[PDB]
Amino acid sequence: PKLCLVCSDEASGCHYGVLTCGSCKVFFKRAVEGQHNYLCAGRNDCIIDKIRRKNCPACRYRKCLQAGMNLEA
Amino acid sequence: PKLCLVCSDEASGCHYGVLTCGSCKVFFKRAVEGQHNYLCAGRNDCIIDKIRRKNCPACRYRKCLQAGMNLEA
DNA sequence: GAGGAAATTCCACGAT
DNA sequence: ATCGTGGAATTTCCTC
Ligand SMILES: [Zn+2]
Ligand SMILES: [Zn+2]
Ligand SMILES: [Zn+2]
Ligand SMILES: [Zn+2]
């Protein structure tokens, strides 16, 4: 019943300091390692869920950071 | 003329009835025969330009239709 | 020449 | 680390 704090999909455990699913954990790692320039086509307010998380890496990454995800955790 | 009526990128000609670039031509063909399930993570006003057009297929497809693109043209 | 469309290449995403 | 899937976009080939 525990949910990913980023996309609300069911969580696989505590990854990089935050309860998250597998895809969001892999996304965050790749985002930090690659130092990605992401641009929201919206207002930087996008809905991030299982379906929509692919739409805006910018808002997804922002949510990762604001939830406290860090590589050195 | 030039300037694709969907994303404002340089237009390659009149495709499916509308002045469009090459990428919006094949996008529309894919989307119109496909499901076009697309969900917007924003307010369905997403900015569609050369940089952001990949972010929201929902809004891109909506702009294709509003511009008047159709298969039977 | 135009434009439709397959073929091709590239990449994000995500499971294992 | 492979690696499958699917979308994106350019390149190549088709008919008219
Ligand atoms: Zn998640
Ligand atoms: Zn966004
Ligand atoms: Zn376009
Ligand atoms: Zn949108």
Author numbering:
A (entry chain B), B (entry chain A): 418 to 490
Paper text:
GCs exert their effects by binding to the GC receptor (GR), a ubiquitously expressed nuclear receptor that drives both the activation and repression of its target genes. GR is normally sequestered in the cytoplasm and binding of GCs to its ligand-binding domain causes GR to translocate to the nucleus, where its DNA-binding domain (DBD) binds canonical activating GC response elements, or (+)GREs, which are pseudo-palindromic hexameric sequences containing two AGAACA (or similar) half-sites separated by 3 bp.
Using X-ray crystallography, we solved five crystal structures of the GR DBD bound to κBREs from the CCL2, ICAM1, IL8, PLAU, and RELB promoters, at resolutions ranging from 1.85 to 2.30 Å. In each structure, GR DBD recognizes an AATTY sequence, with Y representing a pyrimidine base. Arg447 recognizes the first two bases of this sequence: its guanidino group makes van der Waals contacts with the first adenine and a terminal amine forms a hydrogen bond with the second adenine in the motif. Finally, Lys442 makes a moderately strong, electrostatic hydrogen bond with the purine residue opposite the final base in the AATTY motif. Two-dimensional (2D) homonuclear [1H,1H]- nuclear Overhauser effect spectroscopy (NOESY) NMR analysis reveals that the in-solution GR DBD-binding footprint on the IL8 κBRE is consistent with the crystal structure. The largest chemical shift perturbation occurred at guanine-21, which is directly adjacent to the first adenine of the AATTY motif.
